[PDB]
Write a protein that binds this ligand. Structure first.
Ligand SMILES: NC(=O)c1ccc[n+]([C@@H]2O[C@H](COP(=O)([O-])OP(=O)(O)OC[C@H]3O[C@@H](n4cnc5c(N)ncnc54)[C@H](O)[C@@H]3O)[C@@H](O)[C@H]2O)c1
Ligand SMILES: NC(=O)c1ccc[n+]([C@@H]2O[C@H](COP(=O)([O-])OP(=O)(O)OC[C@H]3O[C@@H](n4cnc5c(N)ncnc54)[C@H](O)[C@@H]3O)[C@@H](O)[C@H]2O)c1
Ligand SMILES: [Cl-]
Ligand SMILES: [Cl-]
Ligand SMILES: [Cl-]
Ligand SMILES: [Cl-]
Ligand SMILES: [Cl-]
Ligand SMILES: [Cl-]
Ligand SMILES: [Cl-]
Ligand SMILES: [Cl-]
Ligand SMILES: [Cl-]
Ligand SMILES: [Cl-]
Ligand SMILES: [Cl-]
Ligand SMILES: [Cl-]
Ligand SMILES: [Cl-]
Ligand SMILES: [Cl-]
Ligand SMILES: [Zn+2]
Ligand SMILES: [Zn+2]
Lengths: 383, 380
């Protein structure tokens, strides 16, 4: 049975296994009644899941009268698609439709944090805003990128510079997408997952700690014909993940302050990110950022050394990097390292920086980011 | 300075000359910020930009730290409401030293074009930043700037891409009407009349009696040294009457708000054909007459009122037939067929229209459903 989570006090998230093949299509033409449905995704994810829906759709589609339409759009993969250019193409394609897609349109963003942010924004402006729904296919996008309504596109001058806040009418979470998801991508998203637990529930973090081996194996497992990747670990998985989504959903319904706690490990993660990108992923930087930011709390006497080692353990126990000198990261970027001045500078692109400090695993020092001295920061970065 | 409230919160502040002495101060006061981006077109700009730089620097330096005023001048015309211009303004704002931040407060100084464009720009810059309306067109003062509707055009259509973004303040300096082109004034008057026609019988009447007065002040060639000296109240009244209403219907939130489309149902079909030689209010004026004639045809509206509406429109310089010579000269060769108009009304399959029961009293609290056949008579 699907689990329903609420955002901004309203039905929104519906999670379970395989909602894609048998749920979305019907649930759409039911709740999101419309005559036109524009699906957007990238060739990568598309080619793997597009066919299934065209079937699921036509199915539930023709069942009703008149039958609505499904127009599909495939954009190139990569961060390069979140651009003023494609957005317009998308729009233009839509207006070009016969008949042109109208305000009654219901857009479906099927993808990771990229297709999400892009399609969300597209909807947010098409004829001053039209309905849309999230169908994250990335772990991260499932527990973050798709919850909150934050949408945007990049500019050669920066990322997420142009966009808007546009809440999706529905956020379908089909855990099966994680079957085909690249292992590195899974492990990437896990960072957020952990982040979540670390600032909300001690019990949750602990469970994570236990399930690691279990979950990790599955992802790395060899799927025998006829099978489904997570057969047997469904609840352990579904639980741990929704745990995060649930939290993000909660904090979004509240915040400005509380919502700042979602930036744990990010304060430093982003400074690292700026340098190690794009060879290194987000969650990868955030993972290290978390460790570093964790070490910082202890340094200020807030966090117990015990917990610092516990966070490091959990991260690495899931395949996440824990130091800037991580051997795997090295071979991935020959000729690149993060000076302390570069880090501290990158952080300034946001005398005293604001940071989420943990009092203990599950309990943040405050209900928001605290102000730390540039000097104290400089010591956790110091070799 | 009179203040009208929209969406249960004062945001419209009207009076004469707020520009030269009010906005600048009121901004750094209520819209506290460190960066103020002004956008306008060369036409309107060159005429009023200098004054503000003074008014700003003034009230600006009178505080510490002192905020900045960055100005942007775009070409005049409907051509500026484009994926393009907007993109250039966003880049421009990002290319700044320092880059324009989220604390930015944008000022849209212009007519329905600069308004819709700048409004949208703000609506997306870093997911949305504050902004305020400073309409310089009669129409924009009583419509285009009230409601938060913003957008840009696409070679595939107008207002196809945009968003709803409420301005934090809507300054209405009636003086802008001094320099406003006469044809432009008369253009905006259409809405003004539309307003009264669907809300207050008394208001429409005042409009009538005031025709000669207001029109003269307009057509009149003002010697050096103002334009409406002596007619300020008559004018300020009539105009705010409209704004007031639009503010009300917008704040009353799918009903009462469809009534703002009176004369438009047909006005737009005409518009599509006679544009761009013919203006909006010009088409709407004719559209009103036609839609007025339609109500009477269905037995709703009194023939008396029809003529009354026709009279008022023309008494203000507005066109009243697709045969108006003034029109056909600028439209030599472009005639609107009964099907062509019916076809253009389709682009908005059954046909809904605001019907008047009487001047000041609409038939219903929204647009009614009329037979394509009954419509086919009003046209040609
Ligand atoms: N709240 C927010 O709006 C928010 C928050 C954080 C980050 N972000 C955005 O998130 C983006 C990063 O997104 P991401 O990490 O999800 O990565 P992504 O969107 O780049 O997707 C990662 C890769 O997975 C592939 N893929 C998608 N799911 C797959 C599946 N199930 N099977 C096979 N291949 C699959 C894609 O082709 C892609 O190459 C950033 O660009 C950023 O702008 C947004
Ligand atoms: N947001 C809404 O709900 C809404 C509603 C109605 C109209 N509109 C939009 O409004 C636009 C039409 O705008 P408009 O009728 O204000 O026309 P406009 O802005 O094009 O103004 C006409 C001309 O007057 C000049 N001008 C402006 N005011 C002046 C003044 N007082 N002094 C000197 N010159 C002046 C301009 O440079 C321009 O060339 C359309 O594009 C339409 O989509 C929007
Ligand atoms: Cl189809
Ligand atoms: Cl709808
Ligand atoms: Cl952000
Ligand atoms: Cl919603
Ligand atoms: Cl098992
Ligand atoms: Cl690089
Ligand atoms: Cl302690
Ligand atoms: Cl540096
Ligand atoms: Cl410029
Ligand atoms: Cl022009
Ligand atoms: Cl920037
Ligand atoms: Cl510049
Ligand atoms: Cl507001
Ligand atoms: Cl046409
Ligand atoms: Zn993140
Ligand atoms: Zn109008």
């Amino acid at each position: 049975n699907p689990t329903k989570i609420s955002i901004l006090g309203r039905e929104s998230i519906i999670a379970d296994f395989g909602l894609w093949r048998n749920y979305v299509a019907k649930d759409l033409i039911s709740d999101c009644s419309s005559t036109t449905y524009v699906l957007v995704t990238d060739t990568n994810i598309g080619s793997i899941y597009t066919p299934s829906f065209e079937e699921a759709f036509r199915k539930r589609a023709a069942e009703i009268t008149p039958s609505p339409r499904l127009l599909i759009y495939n954009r190139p993969p990569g961060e390069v698609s979140k651009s003023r250019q494609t957005k317009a193409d998308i729009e233009d394609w839509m207006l070009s439709q016969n008949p042109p897609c109208g305000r009654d349109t219901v857009v479906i963003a099927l993808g990771g944090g990229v297709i999400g942010d892009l399609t969300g924004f597209v909807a947010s402006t098409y004829m001053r805003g039209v309905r849309y729904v999230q169908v994250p296919t990335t772990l991260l996008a499932m527990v973050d990128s798709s919850i909150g309504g934050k949408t945007a596109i990049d500019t050669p001058l920066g990322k997420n510079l142009i966009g808007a806040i546009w809440q999706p009418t529905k956020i379908y979470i089909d855990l099966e997408f994680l079957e085909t998801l690249p292992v590195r991508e899974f492990i990437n998203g896990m960072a957020e997952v952990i982040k979540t637990a670390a600032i909300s529930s001690e019990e949750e973090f602990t469970a994570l700690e236990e399930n690691a081996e279990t979950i990790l194996k599955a992802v790395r497992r060899e799927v025998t014909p006829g099978e489904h990747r997570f057969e047997g670990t469904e609840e352990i998985l579904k639980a741990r993940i929704l745990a995060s989504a649930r939290h993000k959903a909660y904090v979004v319904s509240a915040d400005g302050g509380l919502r700042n706690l979602l930036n744990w490990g990010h304060s430093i993660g982003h400074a690292i990110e700026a340098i190690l990108t794009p060879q290194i992923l987000h969650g990868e930087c955030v993972a290290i950022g978390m460790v570093k930011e964790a070490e910082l709390a202890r340094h200020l006497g807030i966090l117990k050394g015990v917990a610092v080692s516990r966070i490091v353990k959990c991260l690495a126990a899931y395949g996440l990097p824990t130091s800037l000198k991580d051997a795997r990261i090295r071979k991935l970027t020959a000729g690149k390292h993060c000076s302390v001045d570069q880090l501290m500078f990158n952080m300034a692109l946001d005398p005293k920086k604001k940071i989420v400090l943990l009092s203990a695993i599950g309990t943040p020092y405050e209900t928001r980011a605290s102000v730390v001295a540039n000097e104290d920061i400089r010591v956790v970065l110091a070799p």
